[PDB]
Symmetry: C3
Subunit: 209 residues, 3 copies
């Protein structure tokens, strides 16, 4: 019928991950990538990196709308992410695979992204656990920044300096939306300042708690 | 459409995911191979990079798991449903690490219902450059690490890390660990034996069926 | 209602992906929409990326289309003609070399005639692109396959360069040639190729 999230789809027999249309709070249809395999399944994937084929060094407008390909890398769009997390309580999961096939993850108790008027402010709950480490520690309430709209608290333009949009505060390292390095490689996710971690694949996803 | 063959006849010339309806009319999105050996094949297993964990339990293999964007096991209940009626042929398409396509084709293929433990009902091997690795596997029950149904004293699924229609296992199979060996051409990816004592490594595998 | 990827883009489909559009004869066709590159709304009719698909096929194969939505494909000459038979359409060729460098070639006008006209190439001016005009001087050329030689060269161009294309008097391989230099060639070897159209 009118699935409201990937969890509803999973309950309806959809055991394989894939794209499906779900209906947002205002019933706006949105085709999203459902992770039906990982940690119970029913996760709506809003970010995916895997080979650096997609340019993520985009402006505010692009991140607002979303960009990329369903066949590969993408950013679902901030308005969409806000819409997906505005209702109820949602948990955040970050799934990563290093360049040797090791899967690692990080999970957060609650995750919400405010609307554009609030600069897509990140409302992040407690770090639940995960082999990947808590790279988003202290990021609760950080506003979103893109190369053309610096809403971070650093003297440098974080989004430019780390070539990517994120919920920056006082930036010191690149993140999952940074440049996909080739020949550190891929993208970074580290909980320890001064130490980078290279991942080939990244997926940020949400599911009602 | 009740299968990919109906879709092919319907004009769907490109391989890809489409919805079909099992006998009970319950919809199921399946990967159709419309290119290989005349097209119309319904793919129930696909491996390509070892991104998906195939060391799963009976419940997992029963329902199916993985991703439409990559590796997956369509699900034994689904596979049974797809092969329960009439006669279906089985095709296994592999690609080694040097890009060479190899295959194995069987005259008839069917997976029994869960009641009969998804027993493999395999007809005659009709040829294929990949060799007949399923030789003498007909009537074998399906075994997963948690649901042991082979005719051995050991739990084959565990020893070779992977669910399969084991009898008395000897080597790994298409559902085993996707190895990352030091050598790319051999002892890498997944195994399918061309003949007895001669194992070969494959980077990609697809198991598919088509009504005969 | 959507007649092409531009219609889909305009209706909220911002991510590239496969969607159903309706051709002039109203028959549905699932096509790959590039919603990202150069304004988006491009209908991709050819894609190469790893050499997994055999492109050395006959007239019938190229006429209907072949390949996989999950990878490499040729949408089909009848479909390409159908997609460009009305109004004016732009052609874009997006390529990626073996190091990740994206390059492109863009043409102001592009159309593939019907089968009676041997899917003749109707190509407008080269609007630009980092990849250079490799289709230079191919306007009005017929499409040729290994079993249907419609070129002007004494030899069988499609066979000689193992791939179907709008050959004149062949001299090199093209985007529909053997995927090996590695990969495919465009007047330079590339790992990924996408040919796409959008109404102008
Ligand atoms: Ca700043
Ligand atoms: Ca046993």
């Amino acid at each position: 019928e009118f699935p409201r999230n990937c969890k509803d789809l999973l309950d309806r027999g959809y055991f394989l991950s894939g794209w499906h249309t779900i209906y947002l709070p205002d019933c706006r249809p949105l085709t999203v990538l459902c992770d039906m395999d990982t940690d119970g399944g029913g996760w709506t994937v809003f970010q995916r990196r895997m080979d650096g084929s997609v340019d993520f060094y985009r402006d505010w407008a692009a991140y607002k709308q979303g960009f990329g390909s369903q066949l590969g890398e993408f950013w679902l769009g901030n308005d969409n992410i806000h819409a997906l997390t505005a209702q109820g309580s949602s948990e955040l999961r970050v799934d990563l695979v290093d360049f040797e096939g090791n899967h690692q993850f990080a999970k957060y108790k609650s995750f919400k992204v405010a609307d554009e008027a609030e600069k897509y402010k990140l409302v992040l709950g407690a770090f639940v656990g995960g082999s990947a480490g808590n790279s988003l520690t202290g990021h609760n309430n950080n506003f979103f920044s893109t190369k053309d709209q610096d809403n971070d608290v650093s003297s440098s333009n974080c989004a430019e300096k780390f070539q990517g949009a994120w919920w920056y505060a006082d930036c010191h390292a690149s993140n999952l939306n940074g440049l996909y390095l080739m020949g550190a490689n891929g993208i970074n996710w580290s909980a320890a300042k001064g130490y980078k971690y290279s991942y080939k694949v990244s997926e940020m996803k949400v599911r009602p708690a």
